[PDB]
Design a protein around this ligand. Structure first.
Ligand SMILES: O=C(O)Cc1coc2cc(-c3ccccc3)ccc12
Length: 188
């Protein structure tokens, strides 16, 4: 067949009841994740190929970067809670991987301040129990699939994207193939 279990995707052996339809995991420490966001724009190209209004969910992970990796999962929970993901994704990736100016939780906060989130608003969110619940949710979703690498994308708790089965000689063709595979899976 054109799409085959074990080629463009693999099938979870213990599927996850009630999972987000389209669930992406990343780390701001992850070099391929930087490529996925800043160079390939995977999440945006996937969204443009799914029906209007569908739920794409994107969660950060703890297992890269030690202490700061866990701070970034909490900061990502702040970003989700305040709805400022689009304002802080680029400066966080660049601050960790390009300029290497993010070295502490305070440096992460500066990214939000510079992006126009008020200090009191950031700190209140950082310390909130709503943000604790969002951290818990990110952790649980990664645990549900025994996640040990990023970037990763899951469709309906059932299918995991397998980009290692895709020609990457042309960036645009690769992104298309990835997006079309998500569409195909979501229609399964
Ligand atoms: O898990 C793996 O190693 C496979 C994989 C995950 O994300 C990728 C991105 C590219 C890429 C291609 C062109 C430009 C920039 C990045 C290539 C391969 C992979």
């Amino acid at each position: 067949a054109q799409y085959e279990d074990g080629k463009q995707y693999t099938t979870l052996e213990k599927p996850v009841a009630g999972a987000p339809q389209v669930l992406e995991f990343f780390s701001f420490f992850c070099p391929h994740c930087y490529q996925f966001e800043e160079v390939l724009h995977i999440s945006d190209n996937v969204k443009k190929k799914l029906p209007e209004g569908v739920k794409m969910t994107k969660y950060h992970v703890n297992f890269m970067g030690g202490d700061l990796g866990k701070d970034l999962t909490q900061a990502w929970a702040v970003a989700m809670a305040l709805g400022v993901e689009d304002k802080v994704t680029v400066p966080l990736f660049e601050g960790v991987q390009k300029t290497q100016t993010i070295r502490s939780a305070s440096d992460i906060r500066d990214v939000f301040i510079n992006a126009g989130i008020k200090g009191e608003e950031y700190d209140a969110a950082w310390n909130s129990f709503v943000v604790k619940s969002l951290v818990a949710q990110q952790e649980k979703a990664a645990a549900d699939v025994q996640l040990r690498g990023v970037p990763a994308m899951f469709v309906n708790g059932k299918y995991q994207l397998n980009p290692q089965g895709m020609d990457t000689s042309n960036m645009d063709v690769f992104v298309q193939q990835y997006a079309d595979t998500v569409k195909y899976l979501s229609e399964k």
